[PDB]
Amino acid sequence: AFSNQVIQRGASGEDVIELQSRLKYNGFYTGKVDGVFGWGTYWALRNFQEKFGLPVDGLAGAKTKQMLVKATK
Secondary structure: OOOOOOEOOOOEOHHHHHHHHHHHHOOOOOOOOOOEOOHHHHHHHHHHHHHOOOOOOOOEOHHHHHHHHHHOO
16 A cells, blocks of 8 residues: 655655554554654664665665565565
């Protein structure tokens, strides 16, 4: 359900809601799902990238999104 746009710090809206929710389901995102990409989302996403063997950068491009979808199955 992700768009084709890279999700990164400062973003807001539907892609961020889904990103935070998937990271929460996987145990990485602890805060309130608010749809705003700040420190808590950056931290959770980098920890997800590290755990899943992706380059650790805190930006969700195609490969990170695909891994997050696969990991939430």
